[PDB]
Design a protein around this ligand. Sequence first.
Ligand SMILES: [Mg+2]
Ligand SMILES: [Mg+2]
Ligand SMILES: [Mg+2]
Ligand SMILES: [Mg+2]
Ligand SMILES: [Mg+2]
Ligand SMILES: [Mg+2]
Ligand SMILES: [Mg+2]
Ligand SMILES: [Mg+2]
Ligand SMILES: [Mg+2]
Ligand SMILES: [Mg+2]
Ligand SMILES: [Mg+2]
Ligand SMILES: [Mg+2]
Ligand SMILES: [Mg+2]
Ligand SMILES: [Mg+2]
Ligand SMILES: [Mg+2]
Ligand SMILES: [Mg+2]
Ligand SMILES: [Mg+2]
Ligand SMILES: [Mg+2]
Ligand SMILES: [Mg+2]
Ligand SMILES: [Mg+2]
Ligand SMILES: [Mg+2]
Ligand SMILES: [Mg+2]
Ligand SMILES: [Mg+2]
Ligand SMILES: [Mg+2]
Ligand SMILES: [Mg+2]
Ligand SMILES: [Mg+2]
Length: 238
Amino acid sequence: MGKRLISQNRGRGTPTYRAPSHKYKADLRHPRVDENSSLRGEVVGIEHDPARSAPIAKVAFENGEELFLLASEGIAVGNIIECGDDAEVKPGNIVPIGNVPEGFFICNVESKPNDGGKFVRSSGVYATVVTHEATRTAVSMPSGNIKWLNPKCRAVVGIVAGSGRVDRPWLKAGKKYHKMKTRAAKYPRVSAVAMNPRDHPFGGGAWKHPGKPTTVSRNAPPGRKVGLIAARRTGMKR
RNA sequence: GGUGGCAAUGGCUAACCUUUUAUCUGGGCAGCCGAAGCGAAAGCAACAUGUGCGCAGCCUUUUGGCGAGGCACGACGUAUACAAGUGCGUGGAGUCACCGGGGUACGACCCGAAGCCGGGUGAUCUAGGCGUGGGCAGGUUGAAGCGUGGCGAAAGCUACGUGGAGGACCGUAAACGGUAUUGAUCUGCAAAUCAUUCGUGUGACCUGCGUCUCGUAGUGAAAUGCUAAUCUAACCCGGCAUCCGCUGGUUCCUUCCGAAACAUGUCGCAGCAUGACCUGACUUGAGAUCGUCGGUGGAGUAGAGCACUGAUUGGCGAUUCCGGGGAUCCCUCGCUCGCUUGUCAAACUCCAAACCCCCCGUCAUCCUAGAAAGUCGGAGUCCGGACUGCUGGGGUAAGCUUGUAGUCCGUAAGGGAGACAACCCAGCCCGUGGUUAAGGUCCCCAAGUGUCGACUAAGUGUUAAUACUAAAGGGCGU
RNA sequence: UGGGGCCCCGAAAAUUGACGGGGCUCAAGUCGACCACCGAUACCACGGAGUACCGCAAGGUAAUCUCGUAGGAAGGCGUUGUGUUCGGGUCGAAGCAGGGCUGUGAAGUCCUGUGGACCGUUCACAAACGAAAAUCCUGGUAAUAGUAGCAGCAAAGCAGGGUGAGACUCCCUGCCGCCGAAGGGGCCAGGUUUCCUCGGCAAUGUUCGUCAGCCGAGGGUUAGUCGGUCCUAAGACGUACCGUAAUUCGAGUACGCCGAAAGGGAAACAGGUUAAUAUUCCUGUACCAUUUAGCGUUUAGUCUGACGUCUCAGGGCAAGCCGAGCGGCGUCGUCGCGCCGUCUAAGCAGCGAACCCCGUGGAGAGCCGUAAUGGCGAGAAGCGGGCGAAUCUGUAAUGGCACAAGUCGGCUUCACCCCGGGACCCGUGAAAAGGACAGCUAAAUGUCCGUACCGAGAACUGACACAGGUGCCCCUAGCUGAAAAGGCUAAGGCGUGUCGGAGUAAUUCAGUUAAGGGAAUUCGGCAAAUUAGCUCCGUAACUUCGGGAUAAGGAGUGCCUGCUGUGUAGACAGCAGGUCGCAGUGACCAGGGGGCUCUAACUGUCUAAUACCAACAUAGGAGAUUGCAAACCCGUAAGGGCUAGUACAAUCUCUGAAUCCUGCUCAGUGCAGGUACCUGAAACCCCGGUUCAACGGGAAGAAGGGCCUGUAAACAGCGGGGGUAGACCCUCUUAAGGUAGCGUAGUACCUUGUCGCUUAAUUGGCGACUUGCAUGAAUGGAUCAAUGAGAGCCCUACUGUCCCUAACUGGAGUCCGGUGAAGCUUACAUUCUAGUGCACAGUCUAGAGACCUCUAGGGGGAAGUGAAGACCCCGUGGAGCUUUACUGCAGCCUGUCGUUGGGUUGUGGUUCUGGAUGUACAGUGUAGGUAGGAGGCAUCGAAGCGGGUGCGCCAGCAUUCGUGGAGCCGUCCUUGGGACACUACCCUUCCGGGACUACGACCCUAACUCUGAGAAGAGGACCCCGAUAGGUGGGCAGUUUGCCUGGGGCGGGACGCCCUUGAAAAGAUAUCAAGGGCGCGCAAUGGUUGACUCAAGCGGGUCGGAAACUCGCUGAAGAGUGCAAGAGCAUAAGUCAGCCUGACGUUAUUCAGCAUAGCAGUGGAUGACGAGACGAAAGUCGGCUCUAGCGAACUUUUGAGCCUCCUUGGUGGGGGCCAAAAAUGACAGAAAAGUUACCCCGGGGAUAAUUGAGUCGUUGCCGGCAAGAGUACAUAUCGACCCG
Ligand SMILES: [Mg+2]
Ligand SMILES: [Mg+2]
Ligand SMILES: [Mg+2]
Ligand SMILES: [Mg+2]
Ligand SMILES: [Mg+2]
Ligand SMILES: [Mg+2]
Ligand SMILES: [Mg+2]
Ligand SMILES: [Mg+2]
Ligand SMILES: [Mg+2]
Ligand SMILES: [Mg+2]
Ligand SMILES: [Mg+2]
Ligand SMILES: [Mg+2]
Ligand SMILES: [Mg+2]
Ligand SMILES: [Mg+2]
Ligand SMILES: [Mg+2]
Ligand SMILES: [Mg+2]
Ligand SMILES: [Mg+2]
Ligand SMILES: [Mg+2]
Ligand SMILES: [Mg+2]
Ligand SMILES: [Mg+2]
Ligand SMILES: [Mg+2]
Ligand SMILES: [Mg+2]
Ligand SMILES: [Mg+2]
Ligand SMILES: [Mg+2]
Ligand SMILES: [Mg+2]
Ligand SMILES: [Mg+2]
């Protein structure tokens, strides 16, 4: 048995591949609201979240419990939020996507109703509402695809803050090193062709070349799906 | 196999009971072998002596007769399914022990690896992640930003001051590392240290304590590195007394006999099986041939020769061709056919030995104190080598390689060769006397400064064979 | 002139030397003869032992008996014990040491010395039964040897006086020394009594020892305030729930509980006391909690605990320094200086700098500030008040001091405390207990554990009193100086980094200096030297504009006298004059510099113990998957990682900064999509079969495959030649045929390629050309500033690297005292030369030398020692790794069955009605299936017609809605495809097809799934799950990968069969020996009878040409006989004709394969039984004249007939006997690919590199004959061919 790969080591969950959970501030989710309820609340502070490298907002609600929230751009300390079914459309509120007009930008969209939000969450991303049929609504995801969501889904209006995070090049191994200390990723990563034939399917030889084609089928067993997994095309555009 | 009990009306009991302490006495007929074989099976089912040769033994006129066991026939059972031939079987000897040998399975005469698998131990070292603390003498450069001021018509250009950035610079024997001396030491201070010279030294930094990740698994800025002096799969115990055709060892005396290093088969070539060769016992009972001479037969090697098959040298006469030279093919004329000259043959032979082989007769040797033949037990051996012949085959040759006949070393003393595995004499129980073999006789060294007739003038030579000893050519040297 | 004997020339090898040596000349040589003697265990004689065979024994015979390894056989000796017979011993058993006798021997017995209690023997039987060897095991003990070591990084001791049996080593004083930012002080972990006193010195201490961390006896650790205890971090553990065949096993969830002697934290200081304990005991002065009692009260929600890296201002203070007075000590040749001291805790009371808050204030064509950033009508400056620090002042103030002084000022201040500002982050830099806000007074309580000493060049760890490591973890005075560097000294600790004396060789470790030359040394400037601080001047090519840069290259520097400037000060900067030395950073410390190339962008990482690099990483570039109940992965499952995440994300790959760029190919392999068509398992369905099944076919058809399309920043590829100033038309184009670039390269074999610069001279360095064995574009191309313990070459300075060595210094060595090992060893040994020998001898053979012992010295030899070779081969030995090797297993994709329900309809029969619907040659009738080949119905209901009523031929049986008011049977059969009549329609059919079923699609919710505490929401009979069938599948596992071989490999097959030679005149006989062939063909190319003679020549005939057919002659074979070679054949074994199929079924021996002499199957020669062909008959025929053309067991199939399946009989289906076919060519018969330089083990000189030995083809050097050239002349000179 030539040694397992890095992906299977991540599978086991050894301490080298586990996220340092105790650093993260808090989990981000929408307020839990019963049927036919509408709770409000005004921002108390704007705070930095080390799990995403973007700001988050602290909001104190009328019942008493405060929650961190995914901060859309423009959110300022003092503004009140009106999450609920009867909310109007403004930058900051949380409203169903069924009664959001076409052309408006949204973020922190849910998959099924009352999930808290799963799509459109990294820095500066956003999605759009395209069409409103009776049973579904099509939103263009930041990847570039059309998704058909339930009309009774919740999403904050605006775009996620922190836009432009990747216009600043690293230009050092040290800065990227410092980012990786608060993530589960491993840094730095050895290249496969420089290993031994025990360690990887590509290792070995008197000179460093893959030897076999890099594209691998989708049916390859675990421990072999390394390279271009089931690629449809390769190369740049000529 | 040696020795015993019982014996076709066969031999022996097993577990167990009687045990009265393991003994022992008497029971125990279940069962096993023998008594009928043949055939896949269904099935079928034989001589309780018909003939001859004849050993031992007995009788006898010492020649013959009877003649158990032995051998050779004849007859019969069954299978081959049609027949005919043949196979196996048939005229009653087995069974149970004790003392031995051998085969097979088990640790299997004793020791000798790397490995494979099961369950457990380890992150005090080291590798990486996380928690919480500590550390980095002293200097250098001078980014952005800010103030004042010059050149300008706007845009703009520019000097000085302040400021203190950077995986920046220099540098401690603080700390971490480990270039070169290929220095010191190399049974050391040390199972990796020391001296000088060196690299980083505000960061992808060094580090204390705590905590987590581990064996087909972990960790790795990736060398197959590290995981407790162990890592191309750790360590402890168990399977395990693993296994090997491969290496080492295997303990007292004498006596009789005494090999093979070869053929065939083999995933066979460092192994094994069967045969040849050695040894022990038994059965049978009269011939055998290691040798000589004569004869009936087999030769196709040496030598020799051209009569066949292939080559081969000139002269002569013609092929009026099949042919090359320069319009009557003007005419030259090689290949070819005959007579004569000069050479050949391992796959040529009109011829043809000496050795050698089968058989008959004779002599000679062995033999009833057991020829030839047969049956059973135990093996070793299948790495060989050398000398004299075969102009042996191959090769330039070889103390080369591969054959063959004889004899040797292996396993062979003693005598002689300077020493000499296998060259000459000799095949050897112990002691004494005697004469010889090989070889020698100036001294070393036992016995000849021996005899007869010549040669050599070079210290040539003073060297049976021999893996140890020089050639062609020349000499008015003798 | 020829033929002979001996000798001479031809004739050269390496340590000195081989007739065996001395020597030998009418011989001590050679040739031909001869005589005498010596000389074995041979041969003769005598005596003796054993053996073989015979004999009843006595004994007899042996010229025809006496060697021996592997090995076979026979008889005996010994050790311990059992059964049995007979004994010995305190008047001395066993055992041990040495002797006498017996036996061929194993061995027995006796004697003497020792010893002090047990030991034998006859006949038999047993075994934990006999040792010289195993790099054997355990114990004891040699030589080496009184030897190495007791030096290298810290060279330390001397005098006087004691103690004591004994003094270099133990104690006191004086001098002389070592560390002094560690060798001093404080303490973690660790140790565990090492701590103190007394008494000892056998061992321990690298020597001695009266000493001791050693040995013996005794003694020593005191806490409300110092720690633990308490809180929580990473992260563990327990109980429950669930999983697992099961647990002591497994993730998650709930509830608990632990985890820091360096994180948070309620509270104590000074002095004294002991031999060893002290914020712990004692004196004094304090402080903090919990409970009880009394006297009152919340604000109860906030603050604090509570937080990163860098940088800076302000304040304070321990340490430090200076001046004056006072008290001691030192020096005193002269002077009057130098050092020590001049002290004082917590607690309590008081004060408060910055920031911040409040009341006034009214500032702009601008004012107020900071080291700096800055502030301002959203209210500056200024003026008031409030909250608010370290530290400071008083008291505590009487304790300690030689009760000796004990008084004052000043400067500075880190590395410590307080307070505030700024910058940076694709880094954001802990939590909880506790505390504050309502407490005051009084008494009582404050349990438990640790406390000695070390904390390291002697108390820990590495086996040690170990030059390593843990701990340099935290602290440290004066001068020089930037400094905690280096040097010199305090306090403190030591003369123990535990051997001394003596002073004299070589050699050795580490240093100092060196004339003249200056890399000439060497693979290579390795090693060593040069330079070196600070100030000023000056500074190149190139460049990513940041740099290069301390570039390069120059000048100054001491001491004394007097000053100036900045500053609150500490201090810093500058000047003028004088002056000394060879030298002024005077010692310590402290860069040599420059130029041209290759390579990697840079800082970083790496084989702990031979590799610090060009390798790895990196920022930058590109590609791929995935919309989250996702992609990727772990688990048997329960459940999880990524993930407190969401496409500016995670995961998976290639390339490797910047700059200029990145061409052509989709044939191969891989990947993705399409699946028109072909192939494609099981279940269900249909047919046949089976009294039921097994079983055989058909239909249908999932995934996958074929086929098609796309894809190269997917793995990869980018070719020949010959025409043409090496072009370009053609090619060879099995997809295309190298674009920019670079080019003798880190790639170029030829090769030291050609030319230029660099040297007197260059297999070099650089530049240019370049036909590139075998360059080339993210298998990245080219170039590149800065960086480099990277790799080459050149210049300058410098030097003992060198010419060529010399003197000196310290440590060893040499000599003396003490202590005190280890490793090679069969034995002997004073050697040298040659030979011989397993061909590399101190021991053998022949010579030559050598009196013995000891010391020093370097290493010639002992194929010196260390070690079961790492190189090569072998083993039906291993391991890891790779793949389109052989066989499998996980993972994934898909069909079917279960979980699994209710409807919408399209499917098909299943199943059910209205008519026998049934009807062509029609019909009066509709074949009321078929059919008793026909006899009952009918105004008591039967007809012709309608759109037409079952239906069909708009006919007509039924009586239906009628319509006329007869269709009757048919023996008028519409004389029939079927000819027809009611109680029969049992059945072409009709087919609401309702009905259970299986398919394709759609809908619903109640199962089920996800989310939520739950209401509920979202999906939904799908998915997950259990089982089964097919695919893909080096992800993983178990194995195989042969042998021969002038080593293995490569080549080949001498790996099965047949012929000739080798092969030596019977038979046998090897090599990778020579010549070769076969793995077939034929219904005639076979059998038999009959008739004939073939090849080649000569003579004749018409173009029938020297190429045809025919006639005559010669013709033993010169032809033919299927195929190699050899053999055979003439009234034939050849050619042709006639008739035929013996190219037959069954069966026994013998021969060779495989001499002699075992071994399949299988073939070839004789026969036997049964049938034939040809021929008058004899006879011939078991294929093709003879010798090649082929394969076991097991398994399947086929042929004839039988035997058989478990209590009996039958059916279907199996099993068996005999023969034929299907193949194992590695051919006496495995289902079978590579690599290892990361390798491991067991053996081999049974087998290779090269040291040796043998040979000499080749190589080096000569000779013989002389052909010829040399103007004539072979030989002044050169020398052919051939020969040695
Ligand atoms: Mg692999
Ligand atoms: Mg028959
Ligand atoms: Mg400046
Ligand atoms: Mg440095
Ligand atoms: Mg074991
Ligand atoms: Mg001859
Ligand atoms: Mg053998
Ligand atoms: Mg001989
Ligand atoms: Mg012999
Ligand atoms: Mg001899
Ligand atoms: Mg023997
Ligand atoms: Mg012994
Ligand atoms: Mg000092
Ligand atoms: Mg001592
Ligand atoms: Mg605790
Ligand atoms: Mg000394
Ligand atoms: Mg680098
Ligand atoms: Mg790389
Ligand atoms: Mg390309
Ligand atoms: Mg050079
Ligand atoms: Mg073998
Ligand atoms: Mg494998
Ligand atoms: Mg196995
Ligand atoms: Mg071989
Ligand atoms: Mg490697
Ligand atoms: Mg080995």
